[PDB]
Amino acid sequence: PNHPLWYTLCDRYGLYVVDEANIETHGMVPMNRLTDDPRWLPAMSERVTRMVQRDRNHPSVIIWSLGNESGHGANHDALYRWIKSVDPSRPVQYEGGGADTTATDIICPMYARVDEDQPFPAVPKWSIKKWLSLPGETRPLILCEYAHAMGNSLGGFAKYWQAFRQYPRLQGGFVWDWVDQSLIKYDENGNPWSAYGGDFGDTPNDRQFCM
Amino acid sequence: PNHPLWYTLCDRYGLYVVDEANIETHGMVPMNRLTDDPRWLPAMSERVTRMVQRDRNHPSVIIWSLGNESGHGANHDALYRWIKSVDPSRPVQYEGGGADTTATDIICPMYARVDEDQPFPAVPKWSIKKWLSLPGETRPLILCEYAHAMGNSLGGFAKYWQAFRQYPRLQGGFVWDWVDQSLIKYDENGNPWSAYGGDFGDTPNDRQFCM
Ligand code: NA
Ligand code: NA
Ligand code: NA
Ligand code: NA
C-alpha cells in the first residue's frame, strides 16, 4: 500500500490503480513455504484486510492484489475469498504460483512473451496469445510486469502493443518499472553520484538490478 | 456423401472422415436464401438424414458436416439438433455464416490466416490464434479448408503447422485440395491434354480454378 496521498492524486488526475498488499516472500524455498502455512494466515490476513479497510472508497483503485512473488498457498485462496465477500466491486488478482491460479480473476503473468513460450516446470510462462486460449481458460490477461526497462532496454515493446490491440482479451500490462532505485552518494570533492547495490558496503547485494 | 466403398477403405486403412451432406447453395443471394426458408427444410432434411442413416456405422466417420457454403439458416439449426439427437457419438460441424455459428461444435473456417485478420462484414475471417480467444469462445478450431494448393502454391504452409503444434485448441485442418479437377481432351493428332474451365465451350466458366 502506498502513502495515502497517492490514491487521492490518482482519483483527481485520473489513473487506474492496482492496490497491492504488503506481502512478498520471494526468498523462501519453495516460494509458498509461508503462504501455504496456516500459522502465517493471521499475519497475512492483516496485510490484506487492513489495506481493503483503508483504501476501499478510492475510485482510482479498480483492482486488489494479494501481494507479490509469494508462490501460491492456501492462505491466498482464503484471502481471495475474503476480499470477494467484503468488496464485490473490484476484481482480485495475484500472479504467484503460475499467474492463473484459483486466487486470481485476471491472468496476470510477469514477463510472459508475446509469441514465445517459456515452459518452466510447474509455473510456465506461455506466450500471452497462447495463454488466453488454453483449454477451459476464459479470463482476461493483463501482465502485472512486462518489458523490463533495465538500462538500454524496451527492445520489442512494439510487439506487445500490436498484440494488445489485436486481441480483445489481451488488455495490456504494467511496465517494470517507473523509476531507477539509485541512491545519491558524494565523492571526495562533494560531487554527487548515483549509487546502486554494494556501494554502501552492503553484502550480499544485487548490484545494478535495483535500476 | 461419397461412394460407399470409400468409407470401408477409410475404416480399414485408417483415415478420419468428415462426412458431409450434399447441400451447397453458394450462388444464392444472399447465401442463406434457401437455407433460411422453411419450404426448403424438407429437401435439406433428406440430404442430412439419409446420409446419417447410411453411414452411421462406419468407425472412420468421426464428424458430420451439414454441407458447404450455404450461409447460415434456421434449417441448419434444426438439422444440427436432429443429428445431435439421433447420434450423440459424433460432433457436428458447419462453416456457413461465419464458421462459428450455433450450428457447429467446431470453429471450422475456410482460409482464415495464422496471424492476419480479414475483417469482412458479417462473416469475418479472424486470425486462427485470435479466433480461439474471442470473448466467450471455448470450441476447438479445425480449418475445413486451408492452404489453397492452386498451381505453384502452399507458400506459408509451415506457419500453419507451427501454430497447430503450439496451440492446444488449434487441432489442424483440411488442405484444399487433393486432386486437380482437370479433364482429358484430344488434339487433332489424337494426343491427350489436360483441360480446364471453358475448354468444352462451357460459358460462363471459371477457367483454371478447378485445379
Ligand atoms: Na486487447
Ligand atoms: Na529489480
Ligand atoms: Na494443437
Ligand atoms: Na476451385
Residue of B117, B134, B168 with shortest CB distance to A134: B168
Residue B146's closest CA among B176, B181, B166, B185?
B176
Q: Which residues, 6+ apart, have CB-to-CB distance to B200 below 8 Å? A: B183, B185
Residue B93's closest CA among B202, B198, B8, B174?
B174
- Burial class of residue B30, CB neighbours in 10 A (0-12, 13-18, 19+): exposed
Q: Tell me, what amino acid is at B113?
A: R
Distance A207 CA to ligand 2 centre (A): 10
Active site residue A188: no
Q: Which helix (H) or strand (E) segment is B175 a member of?
A: strand B170-175
Question: How far is residue B177's CA from residue B152's CA, in Å, rounded to a whole number?
Answer: 13
| Cell, residue B142 | 479445425
Q: Tell me, what amino acid is at B194?
A: S
Q: Tell me, what amino acid is at B136?
A: G
| Best of B116, B133, B138, B166 to mutate (most A CBs within 10 Å, chain A) | B133
| Cell, residue A82 | 475474503
Q: Do B135 and A169 touch (CB under 8 A)?
A: yes
Compute the Cα dihedral for A50, A51, A55, A59 and give only its sign. Answer: negative
Compute the Cα dihedral for B200, B211, B118, B126 and give only its sign. Answer: positive
Using an 8 Å Cβ cutoff, are A129 and A167 in contact? Answer: yes
| Cell, residue B86 | 439421433
| Cell, residue B52 | 446419417
Q: Tell me, what amino acid is at B186?
A: Y
Residue B130's closest CA among B145, B146, B114, B106?
B114
What's the Cα-to-Cα distance from B194 to each of A11, A27, B153, B206, rounded to whole Å? 74, 73, 19, 15
Question: How far is residue A138's CA from residue B138's CA, in Å, rounded to a whole number?
Answer: 8
Active site residue B145: yes
Distance B16 CA to ligand 4 centre (A): 23
Distance A162 CA to ligand 1 centre (A): 9
Secondary structure class of B51 (helix, strand, coil) = helix
Using an 8 Å Cβ cutoff, are A208 and A151 in contact? Answer: yes
End-to-end CA distance of chain B: 21
| Cell, residue B25 | 447453395
Using a CB–CB cut-off of 8 Å, the residues of A that contact B are: 117, 127, 129-130, 132-136, 138, 166-169
Residue B147's closest CA among B195, B100, B113?
B113
Question: How far is residue B195's CA from residue B211's CA, in Å, rounded to a whole number?
Answer: 10
Beta bridge partners of A49: none
| Cell, residue B74 | 434456421
What's the Cα-to-Cα distance from A25 to each of A38, A68, A73, A82, rounded to whole Å? 15, 8, 11, 21
Contact list, A168 vs chain B (CB under 8 Å):
133-135
Residue of A117, A132, A136 with shortest CB distance to B133: A132
Question: How far is residue B146's CA from residue B160's CA, in Å, rounded to a whole number?
Answer: 9
- For residue B74, the distance in angstroms to the closest alpha carbon of chain A comes to 29
Question: How far is residue A18's CA from residue A34's CA, in Å, rounded to a whole number?
Answer: 24
Distance A58 CA to ligand 3 centre (A): 44
Provide the 8-state DSSP code for B88.
Answer: T
Which ligand ends up closest to the CA of A176?
2
Using an 8 Å Cβ cutoff, are A100 and A131 in contact? Answer: yes
Q: Do A133 and B136 touch (CB under 8 A)?
A: no
| Best of A116, A128, A133 to mutate (most B CBs within 10 Å, chain B) | A133
Q: How many CB atoms lie within 10 A of CB A7?
A: 21
Catalytic annotation, pick one of B20, B69, B116, B137: B69
What's the Cα-to-Cα distance from B201 to each of A102, B97, B109, B204, B210, rounded to whole Å? 68, 34, 34, 9, 16
Reported as half-sphere exposure (CB side, CA atoms, 13 A), residue B4 has a value of 6
- Burial class of residue B136, CB neighbours in 10 A (0-12, 13-18, 19+): exposed
Breaks (C-N over 2.5 A) in chain A follow: none
Residue B13 known to bind ligand: no
| Best of A127, A129, A167 to mutate (most B CBs within 10 Å, chain B) | A129
Residue B209 known to bind ligand: yes
Question: How far is residue A124's CA from residue A144's CA, in Å, rounded to a whole number?
Answer: 15
* Strands B170-175 and B141-146, sheet pairing: parallel
Where in the sequence is the domain holding A149, given as residue range(s)?
1-211
Question: How far is residue A180's CA from residue A84's CA, in Å, rounded to a whole number?
Answer: 35
Which ligand ends up closest to the CA of A169?
1
Q: Tell me, what amino acid is at B52?
A: V
* Strands A61-65 and A92-93, sheet pairing: parallel
DSSP letters of chain A? Answer: ---HHHHHHHHHHT--EEEE-S---TTSSSTTTTTT-GGGHHHHHHHHHHHHHHHTT-TTEEEEE--SS----HHHHHHHHHHHHH-TTS-EE--TTTSSSTT-SSB--BS--SS--B--SSS-B--HHHHHTSTT----EEEEEES---SS--TTHHHHHHHHHH-TTEEEEEES-SS---EEEE-TTS-EEEE-TTTTS-SS--GGGG-
Q: Do A168 and B135 touch (CB under 8 A)?
A: yes
Beta bridge partners of B17: B61
Q: Tell me the CATH number at B128.
A: 3.20.20.80
Q: Which helix (H) or strand (E) segment is B174 a member of?
A: strand B170-175
Chain A CA closest to residue B116: A166
Residue B22's closest CA among B59, B61, B65?
B65
Chain A CA closest to residue B118: A166
Q: Which residues, 6+ apart, have CB-to-CB distance to A137 below 8 Å? A: A100, A107, A131
Q: Do B135 and A167 touch (CB under 8 A)?
A: no
Distance A210 CA to ligand 2 centre (A): 4
> What does chain B come to in residues?
211
Question: How far is residue A39's CA from residue A69's CA, in Å, rounded to a whole number?
Answer: 19
Burial A18-50 (b: 16+ CB within 10 A, else e): bbbbebebeebeebbebbbeeebbeebeebbee
Residue B26 known to bind ligand: yes
In total, how many domains does chain B have?
1
End-to-end CA distance of chain A: 21
Using an 8 Å Cβ cutoff, are B114 and B128 in contact? Answer: yes
- Burial class of residue B161, CB neighbours in 10 A (0-12, 13-18, 19+): middle
Longest CA–CA separation in chain B, Å: 64
Residue B173's closest CA among B118, B211, B210, B131?
B131
Longest CA–CA separation in chain A, Å: 64
H helices of chain B, where? 4-13, 41-55, 74-86, 128-132, 157-166
Question: How far is residue A113's CA from residue A156's CA, in Å, rounded to a whole number?
Answer: 10
- Burial class of residue B128, CB neighbours in 10 A (0-12, 13-18, 19+): buried
Provide the 8-state DSSP code for B207.
Answer: G
Contact list, B167 vs chain A (CB under 8 Å):
130, 133
Q: Tell me, what amino acid is at B108?
A: C
Identify how the structure was determined: X-ray
Provide the 8-state DSSP code for B130.
Answer: H
